[PDB]
Paper text:
Trimeric fibre proteins protrude from each of the twelve vertices. These fibre proteins have an amino-terminal virus-binding sequence, a central shaft domain, and a globular, carboxy-terminal fibre head domain involved in initial receptor-binding. The SnAdV-1 fibre head is the first Atadenovirus protein structure to be solved at atomic resolution. Despite the low sequence identity with other fibre heads, the topology of the beta-sandwich is identical to that of known adenovirus fibre head structures and contains ABCJ and GHID beta-sheets (the E- and F-strands in the long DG-loop of human adenoviruses 5 and 2 are absent). However, it is significantly more compact, making the 107-amino acid long SnAdV-1 fibre head the smallest adenoviral fibre head structure known.
The structures of P212121 crystal forms were solved by molecular replacement using a trimer of the determined structure as a template and refined using NCS-restraints at 2.7 and 1.9 Å resolution, respectively. The two different crystal forms belonging to the orthorhombic space group P212121 both had four complete trimers in the asymmetric unit. When the structures of the fibre head monomer of the different crystal forms are superimposed, no significant differences in main chain conformations were observed. When trimers are superimposed, the r.m.s.d. is less than 0.5 Å, suggesting the orientation of the monomers in the trimer is also fixed.
Author numbering:
A (entry chain D), C (entry chain E): 240 to 344
B (entry chain F): 239 to 344
The structure:
């Protein structure tokens, strides 16, 4: 483990998300994992400003965004100009927890 | 970091076995608590089994008082009441497989 | 953590998969986790030769195969004669990341 950021983000509708970013070295490979939790429900996209460390981490993904599975539906996390966006495929009465990762050489 | 790791096997009347692992981790200002669940068995109704006091204690700590958990074929809710662990499922599962549920807190 | 193998595997349609195998000891219990990532899409099964360490890890599962949930669908990983197979329930336009684990005494 060469990194562990955690932070809580909030929009003005009141929704809170906690994120954890983690980096791990495995010989030739690196793993980067995003962890997300919210107790809230969500109907539209979630937008909130992120710290520079998180924005930096989130930009590193090879696809420029993080496909993430929650118990009730699927989201895409991306960052743009220090604004974090989580878009969802369907409205979620509760978000819950999920993670998204990639492995790289 | 890791300030806790309980693991146990629980069993019901039919003979359905679940293994659980509870984990706590400290991340500066934040704590993460993760429940991991595995069963090779299929499940049609709810799974009820007695849990150790450490596990019951861990499971009760959740801000919603229950653990929403995704398995490969369906969704479950884990809760504890009076030292009885209950896993309720949205649909019957021919195989449970593995899943995790966590939360982050300040 | 008593083990961490990671490798990249590749098939004839251009699809690359990264796998990480992990073993952890927890007092009386062991946990074995497979992690899988691919940025590619996948229509049929994914077949690729694996290292001996990975074949060995994958054979250890009590069911002889790993049921694994990806954001858009479900897969079964198994190994036979050092050939890794990932079968899918539906075609996946993108595979993303997932893990599968078991606990044992």
């Amino acid at each position: 483990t060469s990194l562990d950021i955690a932070e809580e983000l909030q929009n003005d509708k009141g929704v809170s998300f906690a994120f954890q970013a983690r980096e791990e070295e495995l010989g030739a490979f690196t793993k980067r994992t995003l962890f997300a939790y919210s107790g809230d429900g969500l109907t539209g996209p979630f937008k909130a400003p992120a710290s520079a460390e998180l924005s930096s981490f989130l930009t590193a993904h090879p696809k420029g965004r993080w496909l993430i599975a929650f118990p009730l539906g699927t989201g895409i996390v991306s960052v743009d100009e220090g604004i974090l966006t989580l878009e969802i495929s369907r409205s979620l009465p509760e978000v819950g927890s999920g993670s998204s990762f990639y492995l790289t050489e």
